[PDB]
């Protein structure tokens, strides 16, 4: 709620955007445009890690007043992290919600965006700093010698009894599981919508923001079949032209019920039915048989084979219009059910009609971990200079790069699987890897690696005993002399039951502890030494 605070925002500021994301750029370019509206100059920021943030504030170590960070907050008791913070205006708006309340209270230098149907931590502070044992609050925080306005020292006994019996819920917070919550800038759309901004491109940008982690398999939407009311209610109800829409530029954007198979639009088919997980794994194509069952479905559709190696755009007409008009009904009965989802589309003009999510699979492929040593931040500056209507020579290069990665992905999966590199190693499953790729250096592509092997093996070689068990993976960086990256990932098909691994790896860190890092605001990640994991893995079993 800043229909009241936004009228504070005229003077100088700093607009930070914590570590790379599509929520990031989407929620921030809009604010760039907003703040060049009422004549203020401002600052956009790259974060490569929390050290980059602390040196950034060090680099911005002034008394700048309206300082902002978005999509972060769970790092420290940020008053403790931040010394010169005395009365400065801070702002969070983060969807990684499970944050401690030391950051929430002290109502001078934070903004409590607390609003949810979960009144779950109301007394959560009434004993941590308010009470203490082995240390005048008139509590355990103060003296405990029968001086606080069955024995003289059962004071501490009741104190710790309450403390620990409700650490049953403190250990529930930040020590069992993590997630994200709500949108990144849909709140910001409805904020700005009071100020008469009918920027259709802003709607597209927020659609990009949601359809990243609308991936109901990756991160939950929840609002989805409710936003089929909500977002249309934003846009559809207010029609500027009931009769004049046969226009060239930026025709008022639309919504249709289509699919999430990869790049149906810009490529041929029979390679693009091959690289997604949900279509592939449920048809098992890395074995020979899957091509045959695929072929016998192509029979029932009776598309030509020659056509199925032509670009969908390049086909003749009637098939390429009737395609999805067929596929939605005679795919439900042949092992695959749930690729059809709710998304948008629009053209600028005559060139072709871009697909409302097909940018994000180019954006994820704009993470070029090149050896030039500069390119992450340049990738950011390219990305946010991409989402417009203007810069478009580069989006095609993005698509090309994306597809060649996505068809390099499988190339390792067949290699790894039928050699049976699926090491069980006890309570969970376990994977190991040997040398570097420019493909899968960084971890986004690494989770994409894991989330094809996982479905493949765990669905197809077992009974139903072990189909619900979690995942890990190595990933070496010949970049930095040997660090042996790792990421934690969840078991099958439990949308709300998300990661144990917000901290869970730290068990072995607690036991032995070896050079571990958590440099990212991302929890679902760790960083190590080159080969000092084996005994740490023997620890990290349980």
């Amino acid at each position: 709620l800043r229909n009241d605070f936004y009228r504070q925002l005229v003077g100088k500021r700093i607009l930070i955007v914590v570590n790379y994301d599509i929520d990031a750029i989407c929620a921030s370019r809009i604010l760039q445009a907003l703040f060049k509206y009422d004549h203020m100059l401002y600052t956009v920021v790259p974060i490569m890690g929390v050290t980059g943030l602390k040196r950034a504030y060090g680099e911005h170590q002034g008394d700048v007043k309206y300082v902002v960070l978005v999509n972060c907050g769970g790092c420290v008791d940020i008053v403790e992290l931040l010394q010169p913070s005395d009365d400065v205006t801070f702002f969070i708006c983060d969807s990684h919600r499970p944050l401690d309340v030391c950051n929430i209270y002290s109502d001078r230098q934070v903004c409590i965006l607390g609003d949810a149907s979960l009144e779950e931590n109301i007394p959560a502070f009434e004993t941590i700093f308010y009470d203490s044992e082995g240390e005048d609050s008139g509590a355990g925080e103060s003296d405990q010698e029968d001086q606080a306005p069955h024995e003289q020292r059962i004071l501490k006994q009741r104190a710790r009894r309450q403390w620990e019996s409700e650490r049953d819920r403190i250990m529930f917070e930040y020590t069992q599981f993590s997630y994200y919550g709500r949108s990144a800038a849909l709140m910001v759309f409805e904020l700005a919508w009071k100020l008469s901004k009918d920027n259709m491109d802003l709607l597209w940008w927020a659609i990009v923001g949601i359809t990243e982690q609308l991936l109901l398999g990756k991160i939950e939407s929840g609002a989805y079949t409710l936003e089929l009311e909500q977002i249309q209610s934003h846009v559809s109800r207010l029609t500027n032209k009931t009769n004049d829409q046969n226009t060239m530029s930026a025709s008022k954007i639309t919504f249709e019920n289509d699919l999430h198979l990869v790049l149906y639009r810009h490529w041929p088919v029979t390679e693009s039915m091959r690289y997604s997980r949900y279509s592939s794994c449920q048809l098992k194509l890395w074995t020979l048989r899957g091509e045959k069952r695929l072929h016998e479905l192509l029979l029932e559709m009776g598309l030509p084979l020659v056509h199925a190696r032509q670009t969908y755009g390049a086909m003749d007409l009637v098939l390429r219009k009737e395609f999805f008009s067929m596929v939605e009904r005679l795919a439900e009965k042949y092992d695959i059910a749930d690729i059809v989802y709710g998304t948008f589309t629009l053209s600028y003009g005559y060139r072709s009609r871009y697909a409302a999510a097909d940018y994000v699979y180019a954006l994820l492929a704009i993470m070029e971990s090149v050896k030039k040593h500069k390119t992450p931040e340049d990738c950011f500056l390219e990305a946010s200079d991409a989402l417009s209507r203007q810069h478009k020579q580069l989006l095609s290069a993005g698509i090309d790069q994306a597809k060649l990665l996505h068809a390099a992905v499988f190339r390792q999966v067949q290699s790894s699987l039928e050699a049976r590199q699926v090491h069980s190693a006890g309570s969970f499953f376990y994977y190991v890897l040997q040398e570097e790729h420019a493909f899968f250096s960084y971890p986004y592509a690494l989770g994409l690696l894991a989330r094809f092997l996982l479905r493949g093996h765990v669905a197809t070689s077992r009974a139903r005993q072990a189909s619900d068990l979690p995942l890990i993976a190595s990933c070496p960086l010949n970049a930095s002399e040997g660090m042996c990256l790792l990421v934690g990932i969840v078991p099958v098909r439990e949308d709300s039951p998300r990661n144990f691994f917000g901290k869970a790896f730290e068990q072995a860190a607690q036991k032995s502890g070896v050079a571990l890092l958590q440099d990212f605001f991302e929890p679902a990640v760790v960083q190590l030494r080159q080969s000092d994991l084996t005994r740490f893995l023997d620890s990290l079993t349980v």
Binding site: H295, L299, P304, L305
Partner: protein, 267 residues
């Protein structure tokens, strides 16, 4: 007709009545096996025909053209009815035979072998390349500017959109169907000769589904059927009418088999 309908109907009550290989007979599934891959070269077993209904050896030679045509109608009315989406790619079919209890060597066939079932082999030599043909009779009327309609022999009826008139005509280079074509020269092997003389030879025609399959200098197996060029200019003659000979190709088997080859048992 009553009996002359039963041929296709016996094919229909064949391809789901005769069984081998412990159930799920091939032609129940061979035809869809081939409609998947977009091949349009279904093949028949003769020995299976002798196992099911031996009637189809005497009924054939009186005009095997009509036998093959009454074959192909069945594949059409099966496939394009059961895969109605199929009617896009080729929309035409014919069948093949690969089981004949006889290998007729060259220099063994005469006028008695006219227009009937054959098997023969030999070796390829030089022949033509690859060319297409015509398939249908359609003209363009030139008096009144209409088209005569759709219709080795000419037809030319007087009935047409031009008040059934315009004996004259002209022709377009489109809206009429075409057909691939190629020739061959069959010579006999230099093993099974009469031990040191010239060899003998015949020409052979193969058709559109069968091209870029053969090659100069190859081993061969063909069913074929004996042709008769109907007139090499009958007139005042030589000491012989100038008459000629070809065989028309139904189905080849190659003997080298340089591909992934054999069909598959069920178990």
């Amino acid at each position: 007709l009553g009996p002359r309908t039963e041929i296709a109907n016996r094919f229909q009550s064949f391809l789901r009545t005769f069984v081998d290989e412990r159930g799920a007979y091939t032609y129940r599934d061979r035809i869809r096996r081939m409609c998947e891959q977009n091949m349009s070269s279904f093949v028949v077993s003769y020995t299976d025909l002798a196992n099911k209904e031996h009637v189809l050896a005497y009924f054939l030679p009186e005009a095997p053209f009509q036998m093959l045509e009454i074959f192909d109608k069945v594949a059409k009315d099966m496939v394009l009815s059961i895969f109605p989406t199929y009617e896009r790619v080729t929309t035409e079919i014919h069948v093949r035979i690969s089981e004949l209890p006889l290998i007729e060597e060259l220099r063994t066939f005469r006028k008695l072998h006219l227009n009937q079932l054959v098997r023969t082999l030999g070796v390829v030599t030089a022949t033509t390349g690859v060319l297409p043909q015509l398939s249908v009779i359609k003209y363009d009327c030139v008096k009144c500017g209409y088209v005569l309609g759709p219709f080795n022999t000419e037809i030319k009826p007087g009935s047409c959109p031009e008040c059934q008139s315009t004996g004259p005509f002209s022709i377009n280079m489109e809206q009429t169907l075409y057909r691939n074509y190629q020739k061959i020269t069959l010579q006999e092997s230099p093993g099974r000769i009469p031990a040191g003389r010239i060899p003998r030879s015949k020409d052979v025609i193969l058709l559109a589904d069968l091209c870029d399959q053969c090659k100069p200098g190859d081993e061969l197996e063909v069913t074929g059927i004996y042709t008769n060029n109907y007139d090499g200019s009958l007139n005042t003659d030589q000491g012989f009418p100038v008459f000629a000979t070809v065989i028309i190709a139904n189905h080849v088997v190659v003997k080298d088999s340089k591909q992934v080859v054999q069909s598959l048992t069920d178990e």
